[PDB]
Amino acid sequence: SFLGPEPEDLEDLYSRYKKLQQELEFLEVQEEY
Amino acid sequence: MITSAAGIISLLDEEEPQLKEFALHKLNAVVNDFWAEISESVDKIEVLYEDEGFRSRQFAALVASKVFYHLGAFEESLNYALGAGDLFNVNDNSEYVETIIAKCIDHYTKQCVENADLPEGEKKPIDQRLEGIVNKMFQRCLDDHKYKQAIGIALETRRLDVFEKTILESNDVPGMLAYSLKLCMSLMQNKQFRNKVLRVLVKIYMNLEKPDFINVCQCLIFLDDTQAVSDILEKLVKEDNLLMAYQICFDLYESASQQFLSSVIQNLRTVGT
Amino acid sequence: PAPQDVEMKEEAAAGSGSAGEGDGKAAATEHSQRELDTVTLEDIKEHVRQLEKAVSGKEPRFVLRALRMLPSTSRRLNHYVLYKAVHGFFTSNNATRDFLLPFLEEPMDTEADLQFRPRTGKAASAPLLPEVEAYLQLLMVIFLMNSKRYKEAQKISDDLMQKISTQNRRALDLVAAKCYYYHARVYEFLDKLDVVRSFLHARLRTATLRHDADGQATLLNLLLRNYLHYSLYDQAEKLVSKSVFPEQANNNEWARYLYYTGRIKAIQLEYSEARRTMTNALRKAPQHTAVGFKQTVHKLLIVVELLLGEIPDRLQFRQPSLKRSLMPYFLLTQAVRTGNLAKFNQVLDQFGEKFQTDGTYTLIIRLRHNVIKTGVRMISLSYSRISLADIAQKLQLDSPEDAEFIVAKAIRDGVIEASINHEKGYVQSKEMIDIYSTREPQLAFHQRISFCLDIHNMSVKAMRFPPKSYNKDLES
Amino acid sequence: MALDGPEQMELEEGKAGSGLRQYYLSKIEELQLIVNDKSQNLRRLQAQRNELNAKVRL
Amino acid sequence: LQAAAGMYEQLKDEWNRKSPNLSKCGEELGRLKLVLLELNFLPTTGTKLTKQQLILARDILEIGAQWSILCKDIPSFERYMAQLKCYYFDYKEQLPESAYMHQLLGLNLLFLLSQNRVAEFHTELERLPAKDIQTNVYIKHPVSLEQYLMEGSYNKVFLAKGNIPAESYTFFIDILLDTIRDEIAGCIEKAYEKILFAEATRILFFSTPKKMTDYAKKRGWLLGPNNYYSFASQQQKPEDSTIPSTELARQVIEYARQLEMIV
Amino acid sequence: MVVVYLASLIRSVVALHNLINNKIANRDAEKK
């Protein structure tokens, strides 16, 4: 709901992991460059 | 205590239909210890899953899948499991066959990105068992009442199944738009999919009778669509609020150029004061 | 009371744990951590803590006061070490190591990375759970054969150790990789027909997708030993072939991997592959701490090199100061030199009690073939054409036929490398020389360089990694 | 995740829900993981390139 | 008939060392299977409690094994034999009993050897020891052979004379013997040039010059009534003479390219 | 490869224990 069940716990991890990937990609490119 | 498989392999080999059928029930527990020796006999267990003279297929598919992942072929292991369509409840509850479940989610994502891109559905290449897993994930979101987790999986998978009108299956309608714009531009480098997500937001604004005011303005400038700005203006006639109107219009102006400026004024008169 | 129990045991483990777990999740620091782990950590905990101010002591007070009360069998093994509800196989110290009085002295104080037991009662609020469970479990397993605990405690670190980390991330596997290893040295010691295998196998496959090479390595060692106990050749044969063995895992563990591999292969008459592993094994082991494993490896080593058709050096038996035990092994080498059966057969029996103990005895039966084989290859290599009659007398063979049959088994393999010409009855060696007017040397050199090459790229690469980990680590 | 060891019992928010939640996460997590291991190599390549770039440019 | 220990073993005794039959002791061996499903639902866990069920299990499969050996069919024997072994290993030889297990055991050893499955041979050697529980008469044949065969005294083997004493072993001994004869036969060609017929019967493990003519011919020596060892023999002796040059160099370009790239 | 590794082996204990004290110090130091 809006208390904090297990799916909210799902949303949190999802959000951070996704957002964080494009920035990690620039760093992955630097190794190659 | 027994450490050798040898007896089991012979039961499977023998001509007795009864012995062959029995073997699979006994096998599930051990085929994660004895498994190395059982690989020899991978062929007999596959025949029993194949052959419709048994309804031991379900049990057979599990044993046969189990030998395969151990062996180093993860894909064909999965493939047997999806075919019987053996329940995932059993695999989850065990710590042996964690392997297969892990491969199933990651296999699911490869199929889904290509299929999901333009059409609403996720198409035939993703069979009933994969969908069946996804459905379990789907229930959790609905319960939560929150669109953002639906949004988080839908971008990566590239689904439009749960990225559009998932408020008919119940999730949070307001607030949806902001999250969707900021993630999609940054993460995505596929234009075809990007455009879709943006086209969906034009439909989402309409559900609401006061949609978010920042979000319309991004769609207006990039797409060149008079349509994104238009739903918010349509709602405001019906609502009759000066305070509500002003914020949207100032947000729009900054982004907008002169070509946009001409086009909005016309829309606004049409809908009404 | 004893202030030594509290301050030394809780602090020493604390530094080590925090720094590794934190570092491992953050970045791949792995070369640096491995160097710390084998030499310092094991030595300090083992030797000095036995004689303190209380009886024994490895580090069971960091599994008692930054335990965190995990779902692990860290706590279960602890209860036996102290007294909480069961005395177990070892008695508690009332000189402030108590589990009967929990929440006694702590020098560590708060810091989440550091671990702390009254700060939190469960670690199940994060993905940290598998690595801290693995870490405490590690401390426990080393100590258990050391303080002569038996029965239940050994079996719940063989099946249940496996249960604790099977769902893992790279960091979690890396802490757990250690945990499995210190379990492996106790595991060789007691043989079971009980099948620990199931969990071990199923966890091996899921972790490879998850990441971490080190975890994969240790489970392969454990598993070879499982077959050894059962004494079934077939099952072990599958495991060696399938594996190549990667290089990320510490130096102590590699030595254990090579010794086990070498041992099993040789019985089949695969003396050739096995010798390479065993020679690497001796050399891979540590210094003084290693010594007890090293002697067993040194017994097997003479036998595998002897099996090839080589006659090992006499100084080698002499030099380690286990010379006495080495004395039958030297005699076996001498029996092989002369080619006489009579000395070889009598020695094998007399010393047989001592050989069985080492585990070497199975190989020693195969050595009978070598006694005559080494002698005929030596003589033929040296002087090419010798009559069949002459070889029969030297070895004490039955007949000129008896010799010809030795040559027949060998030739196809290539050992003796000669042929029997019954044109008059002699053995004639293949040998000729003047290879430098043929292209053949360019090949010999070509493979040597290719082999070296892959290592050169590796040399440059690995070298830089540990000083850089240390520069990245914060220092005072 | 609010755990990564074995615990709970199934419901599709139990062990089954938690175990499937972890796999949905693992594809996202893997990208995070390859880069932390990648950082060690990146600095190695960096130090050597900084010395080399300073000398050629000098 | 119907069989399973504690109430039957009639067929084991009726099969051989009484009269020859397998027309009751392997023809009726399809209904024994139905009790076997029960028995085999219990050595999932291998414990001393399981013993009672375990001996009945073995009993059909001992009669099963026995019919296959007499009948001269190796694959049927192999399925039957394999079960008995895992059913010994439940504290490692929990059941080393019966003298209608004795023969099987020896047979199993020679069987593994005929296939030239070396791994399996060693696995059995270690698993089995009931070679003095059931005592050295027919079981002695693979044992003698292991010692001799490892030593490389082919003369000593006691496999080219283990045909005469047999329970029904004679068959297994013969296939294994044929393997021994081949190994030597190819090698000898390389060994030396055109040697006497008599010399080429002696250490070729043959019985007559007639057996040698047919056997040699398939191998590629003595195609005619004159030895042809000479083709094969001459090839082996000079190892240091061969220059096709460019062909032998084996692509110098590739090795060079691997080497250059790093620098 | 040998030379660096020997320097590393003595440094290790020192460097790894100290890290935890410096880490804590850094977070607080950063704020001001």
UniProtKB/Swiss-Prot annotation, chain A:
Residues with Phosphoserine modification: S1
Subcellular location: Cytoplasm; Nucleus
Assigned protein family: Belongs to the AAA ATPase family.
Assembly notes: Component of the 19S proteasome regulatory particle complex. The 26S proteasome consists of a 20S core particle (CP) and two 19S regulatory subunits (RP). The regulatory particle is made of a lid composed of 9 subunits, a base containing 6 ATPases including PSMC4 and few additional components. Interacts with NR1I3. Interacts with PAAF1. Interacts with TRIM5. Interacts with ZFAND1.
Known function: Component of the 26S proteasome, a multiprotein complex involved in the ATP-dependent degradation of ubiquitinated proteins. This complex plays a key role in the maintenance of protein homeostasis by removing misfolded or damaged proteins, which could impair cellular functions, and by removing proteins whose functions are no longer required. Therefore, the proteasome participates in numerous cellular processes, including cell cycle progression, apoptosis, or DNA damage repair.
Name of the protein: 26S proteasome regulatory subunit 6B
Native source species: Rattus norvegicus
Gene: Psmc4
Full protein stretch here: 28 to 60 of 418
UniProtKB/Swiss-Prot annotation, chain B:
Post-translational modification Phosphothreonine, affected residues: T273
Modified residues (N-acetylmethionine): M1
Domain of life of the source: Eukaryota
Function: Component of the 26S proteasome, a multiprotein complex involved in the ATP-dependent degradation of ubiquitinated proteins. This complex plays a key role in the maintenance of protein homeostasis by removing misfolded or damaged proteins, which could impair cellular functions, and by removing proteins whose functions are no longer required. Therefore, the proteasome participates in numerous cellular processes, including cell cycle progression, apoptosis, or DNA damage repair.
Assembly and oligomerization: Component of the 19S proteasome regulatory particle complex. The 26S proteasome consists of a 20S core particle (CP) and two 19S regulatory subunits (RP). The regulatory particle is made of a lid composed of 9 subunits, a base containing 6 ATPases and few additional components including PSMD1. Interacts with ADRM1. Interacts with ZFAND1.
Family, as annotated: Belongs to the proteasome subunit S1 family.
Name of the protein this chain belongs to: 26S proteasome non-ATPase regulatory subunit 1
Organism: Rattus norvegicus (Rat)
Lineage, top ranks: Eukaryota, Metazoa, Chordata, Craniata, Vertebrata
Gene coding for it: Psmd1
Part of the intact protein present: 1 to 273 of 953
UniProtKB/Swiss-Prot annotation, chain D:
Function: Component of the 26S proteasome, a multiprotein complex involved in the ATP-dependent degradation of ubiquitinated proteins. This complex plays a key role in the maintenance of protein homeostasis by removing misfolded or damaged proteins, which could impair cellular functions, and by removing proteins whose functions are no longer required. Therefore, the proteasome participates in numerous cellular processes, including cell cycle progression, apoptosis, or DNA damage repair.
Protein name, entry field: 26S proteasome regulatory subunit 8
Modified residues (N-acetylalanine): A2
Subunit and partners: Component of the 19S proteasome regulatory particle complex. The 26S proteasome consists of a 20S core particle (CP) and two 19S regulatory subunits (RP). The regulatory particle is made of a lid composed of 9 subunits, a base containing 6 ATPases including PSMC5 and few additional components. Component of a complex with USP49 and RUVBL1. Interacts with PRPF19. Interacts with TRIM5. Interacts with NDC80. Interacts with PAAF1. Interacts, in vitro, with the thyroid hormone receptor (in a thyroid hormone T3-dependent manner) and with retinoid X receptor (RXR). Interacts with ERCC6.
Disulfide bonds: none
Family affiliation: Belongs to the AAA ATPase family.
Taxonomic lineage from the root: Eukaryota, Metazoa, Chordata, Craniata, Vertebrata
Subcellular location: Cytoplasm; Nucleus
Transmembrane segment boundaries: none
Shown part of the complete sequence: 1 to 58 of 406
